[PDB]
Design a protein around this ligand. Structure first.
Ligand SMILES: [Mg+2]
Ligand SMILES: [Mg+2]
Ligand SMILES: [Mg+2]
Ligand SMILES: [Mg+2]
Ligand SMILES: [Mg+2]
Ligand SMILES: [Mg+2]
Lengths: 24, 71, 87, 179, 118
RNA sequence: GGGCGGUCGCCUCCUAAAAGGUAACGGAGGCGCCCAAAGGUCCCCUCAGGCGGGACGGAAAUCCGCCGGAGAGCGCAAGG
RNA sequence: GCCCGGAUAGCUCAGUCGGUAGAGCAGGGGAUUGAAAAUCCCCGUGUCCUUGGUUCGAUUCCGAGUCCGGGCACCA
RNA sequence: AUCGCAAAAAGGUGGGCCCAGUUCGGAUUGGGGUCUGCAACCCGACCCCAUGAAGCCGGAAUCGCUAGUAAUCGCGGAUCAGCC
């Protein structure tokens, strides 16, 4: 989901990746 | 006495946390931990929560001296 | 989301801390809250524009890393109602 | 049988000498009875009485408490005559120390409040209701019969006159201080 | 298949039934199993009956007991009003306290369509 | 004075004048019942309030200690 | 006192010929109609008389009557 | 214009989450750690964390859509530091 705190595309819609799901 | 509804309170041993627990009276042998947890004048039994566990770079003195520059 | 640089405004950084030189009356007039309240002096009363007017704040030793940004009364909300809807 | 009885006999009886007491044999203060009450908690837990607090209370101290009646039908709190609502028990024996040494050592930790209870809860003639809050979480009961918060109320009655003569006993027996 | 916590989600995947234990979430039920070696696609019911009971002490080591931090949800609101601040009656009047709009959207802490006269 | 209105029997207090009785369209009130226990015998206990407290609790729920000799209660109005 | 037909939601009512159920108001805003009336829409209120029994049941059948009526007596 | 933007998205030949108010789903939340930036609170993205209330397709009939048209998915700007 887009509006979730952490999904696949929830980092895309909100701008940056996570501290458990990094860039690579 | 009144033998009847009143149970016999069958013996069961508690797991001896802070010294010997008061002995086998009830059939409930389990605690979480630490029967006394301190000697009970409450000798600061802290686990360092949201308060001053992290004391570096805050609750400290930064940005120069003791601020003589005021006036 | 606070960082290693605890910023106070250069207009208001050390011009609140005139108490620590000698010791004076328990009021001094700062302006901002986006700047951090000064951690050098404790226990006294700091005058501030608290959102509505220049009314002071008084700490009671409960702040370790808590933000002063929750101190802003200017929305004197009396209660609900008084709407006159459908317009 | 023996449960902290050495602290009962040589931490009380010679400790009440040289600073307290008239130092004869019986006016040294001691324990007579410790009443324990439910009092329905807040209000009536059910329209008809269920008698299960006698079962879990008979689990925690192994005896049935008497379910006693109600007073005159004032009917502001739907008060009524009959259908008993008391749940009071004194039960003074060495069976007093059987449960009182359990709750003496398990109830000051394992429930969360400010550390201890009032030294201002002493009353005239030394009878001292202590007044714990709930303790249905960790009286080693493992969540048995979780109906409500459903606390209880304890009063440990001393013998002597003054609050300094019950205060002479109770925290030398192991109670906290200054809340 | 008993769990480390209290509310049992009735025999699901180890990524699912172990998760909504209090004190546990996605990034604790995801890393708490790959260290112990359990494949995250397996069931809690299809776990080893010794892994049922020995994966319980690992959860109860550091964080404060279930219901106590939920009481710190109401106690942090108490300690922020150390002098009775304005954020306290930001909280106790039934509204979000971040600073959302409250005529439209952010209808959550307000009672849903509760009170108007006109 | 009659009519209109009120009342027609029983119980309680006063009027009722320290034995009993005693009137008025004199004052204040109740009743046409109810309890297989609200009965008999035997065996235990003493109430209502006030003070000091409590975990909720109205200042009244339930519990402890002291004072409290009958100011409670005795199915129902009043008297004993 | 024998016999006769029934007691449904502040109000009263759609009922069964044993397997069903409620619509209307002082009520708030509501596609409406170009923002006007409310035509029309969600909606606040069933011991279906008290109780026993064929019955898969009872929101409905049958028996005593406590609830109200007409006829019929009978009242020393 | 290659070099690097970016990851094109269901492409997965995948293991599973088993009718569930449920890892489908979701915000408000008070503490810590990184800021591009005088400075992010009450006006940083919201970053692993806390925690996840509402929802099983809606009424009196509306309203963007005729074959590359709906529909989730995928990319950049424009004042531009986050981005509101
Ligand atoms: Mg859940
Ligand atoms: Mg006489
Ligand atoms: Mg006479
Ligand atoms: Mg009698
Ligand atoms: Mg729900
Ligand atoms: Mg963009």
């Amino acid at each position: 989901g887009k509006g979730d705190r952490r999904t696949r595309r929830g980092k895309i819609w909100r701008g940056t990746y996570g501290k458990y799901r990094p860039r690579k | 006495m009144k033998e009847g509804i009143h149970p016999k309170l069958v013996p069961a041993r508690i797991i001896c946390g802070c010294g010997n627990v008061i002995e086998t009276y009830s059939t409930k042998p389990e605690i979480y931990v630490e029967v006394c947890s301190k000697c009970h004048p409450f000798y600061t039994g802290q686990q360092r929560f949201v308060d001053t566990e992290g004391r570096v770079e805050r609750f400290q003195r930064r940005y120069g001296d003791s601020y003589r520059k005021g006036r | 989301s606070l960082k290693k640089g605890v910023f106070v405004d250069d207009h208001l950084l050390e011009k609140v801390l005139e108490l620590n030189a000698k010791g004076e009356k328990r009021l001094i007039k700062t302006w901002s809250r986006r700047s951090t309240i000064v951690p050098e002096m404790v226990g006294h009363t700091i005058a501030v524009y608290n959102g509505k007017q220049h009314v002071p704040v008084y700490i009671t030793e409960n702040m370790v890393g808590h933000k002063l940004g929750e101190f802003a009364p200017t929305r004197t909300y009396r209660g609900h109602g008084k709407e006159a809807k459908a317009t | 049988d023996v449960a902290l009885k050495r602290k009962y006999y040589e931490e009380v009886r010679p400790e009440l000498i040289r600073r307290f007491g008239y130092q004869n044999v019986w006016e040294v203060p001691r324990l007579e009875k410790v009443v324990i009450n439910q009092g329905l908690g807040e209000a009536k837990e059910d329209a008809r009485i269920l008698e299960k607090a006698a079962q879990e209370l008979a689990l925690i101290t192994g005896q049935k408490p008497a379910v006693t009646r109600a007073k005159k039908s004032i009917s502001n709190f739907k008060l009524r005559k009959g259908m008993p609502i008391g749940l009071r028990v004194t039960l003074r024996r060495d069976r007093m120390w059987i449960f009182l040494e359990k709750l003496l050592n398990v109830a000051l930790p394992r429930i969360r409040d400010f550390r201890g209870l009032n030294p201002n809860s002493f009353d005239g003639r030394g009878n001292y209701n202590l007044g714990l809050r709930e303790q249905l979480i960790f009286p080693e009961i493992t969540y048995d019969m979780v109906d409500a918060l459903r606390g209880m109320d304890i009063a440990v009655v001393t013998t002597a006159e003054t609050d300094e003569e019950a205060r002479a006993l109770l925290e030398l027996l192991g109670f906290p201080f200054r809340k | 298949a008993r769990i480390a916590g209290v509310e049992i989600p009735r025999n699901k995947r180890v990524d699912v039934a172990l998760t909504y234990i209090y004190g546990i979430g996605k990034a604790r039920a995801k890393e708490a199993l790959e260290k112990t070696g359990i494949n995250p696609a397996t069931r809690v019911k299809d776990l080893t009956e010794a892994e049922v009971v020995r994966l319980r002490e690992y959860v109860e080591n550091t964080w404060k007991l279930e219901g106590e931090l939920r009481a710190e949800v109401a106690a942090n609101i108490k300690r922020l009003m150390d002098i009775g601040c304005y954020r306290g009656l930001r909280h106790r009047r039934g509204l979000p306290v971040r600073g959302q709009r409250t005529r439209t959207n952010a209808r959550t802490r307000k009672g849903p369509r509760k009170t108007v006269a006109g």
